[PDB]
Design a protein around this ligand. Structure first.
Ligand SMILES: CC(=O)N[C@H]1[C@H](OC[C@H]2O[C@@H](O[C@H]3[C@H](O)[C@@H](O)[C@H](O)O[C@@H]3CO)[C@H](O)[C@@H](O)[C@H]2O)O[C@H](CO)[C@@H](O)[C@@H]1O
Ligand SMILES: O=c1ccn([C@@H]2O[C@H](COP(=O)(O)OP(=O)(O)O)[C@@H](O)[C@H]2O)c(=O)[nH]1
Ligand SMILES: [Mn+2]
Length: 273
């Protein structure tokens, strides 16, 4: 019998200063975040959060971005009073990148740790500027990174659903999760948007001030070149989503490391079939 947490956290400070030009030492971040437990798990000591959140980051060869991510998000996620865990889904090998398949791995593997009922899918290079931007689920699928600096602090188009988002366990299951066959850059977030609409849902978003988000500038990743089949794929989601996703997923976990501030799941997700 801890009480429920207040519906909105009283700890929040709003707008925050974010910068990416200093070094980050995860040992020190760990000491600055003493309440974050092994594998990057935290729940509040004083009340029970209804938000059981697994944060899923698709990842390969972005360790520097990830330290920033961890330095900025951990304090924010605790102020939001979430019962949360961080999962970095690391794609083994050096073949073409598959953001959405790694996201599916994250959903399925996090569920083996704990009864999570909310999933935040976050690119590793996106940091929220205002802690009023809730990193948890809503009654409709939630788009979080709504006002990114690299798109002029607004949406690049109104159906944009990339960057950072949150789906309840029921929402993600309803759309058969995410597509597995978007290899290389582009389109998979649009396909996911399509899925949600085809299943009767609409996108919920904070306002453009609360939703303000920074992207860490970086040059192009090798092995994630624009997918030329992306425009064709997103035109057929309605039919393809029925049998491409959670119900067609396999992968092989090579390694799970519990670090102080995150669990990292190293996974072989194959190449195109
Ligand atoms: C189907 C698809 O590709 N969806 C993308 C969507 O694509 C819109 C166009 O993006 C251009 O590339 C832009 C990119 O979107 C920006 O991030 C960046 O600042 O500049 C590049 C290059 O100018 C392509 O040139 C064009 O053909 C389309 O692909 O963009 C969104 C937002 O990036 C993405 O999440 C989604 O997957
Ligand atoms: O080699 C790669 C390619 C992409 N990603 C992950 O997938 C996301 C999407 O790619 P990208 O950086 O090109 O999109 P951007 O955020 O620049 O708009 C990244 O933020 C990372 O989380 C990664 O870790 N390594
Ligand atoms: Mn990026």
């Amino acid at each position: 019998s801890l009480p429920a947490c207040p519906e909105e956290s009283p700890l929040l400070v709003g707008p925050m200063l974010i910068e990416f030009n200093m070094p980050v030492d995860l040992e020190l971040v760990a000491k600055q975040n003493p309440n974050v437990k092994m594998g990057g798990r935290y729940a509040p000591r004083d009340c029970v959060s209804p938000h059981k959140v697994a944060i899923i980051i698709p990842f390969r060869n972005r360790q520097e971005h990830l330290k920033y991510w961890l330095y900025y998000l951990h304090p924010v996620l605790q102020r939001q009073q979430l019962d949360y865990g961080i999962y970095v889904i690391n794609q083994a090998g050096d073949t073409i990148f598959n953001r959405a398949k790694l996201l599916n791995v994250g959903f399925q593997e996090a569920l083996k740790d704990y009864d999570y009922t909310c999933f935040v899918f976050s690119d590793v290079d996106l940091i929220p500027m205002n802690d009023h931007n809730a990193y948890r689920c809503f009654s409709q699928p939630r788009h979080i990174s709504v006002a990114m600096d690299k798109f002029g602090f607004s949406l690049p188009y109104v159906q944009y659903f990339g960057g950072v988002s949150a789906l309840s366990k029921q929402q993600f299951l309803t759309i058969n999760g995410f597509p597995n066959n978007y290899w290389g850059w582009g389109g998979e977030d649009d396909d996911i948007f399509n899925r949600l609409v085809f299943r009767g849902m609409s996108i919920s978003r904070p306002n453009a001030v609360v939703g303000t988000t920074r992207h860490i500038r970086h040059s192009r990743d090798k092995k994630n070149e624009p997918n030329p089949q992306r425009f064709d794929r997103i035109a057929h989601t309605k039919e393809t989503m029925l049998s491409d996703g959670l119900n067609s997923l396999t992968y092989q976990v090579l390694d799970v490391q519990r670090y102080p501030l995150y669990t990292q799941i190293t996974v072989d997700i194959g190449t195109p079939s």
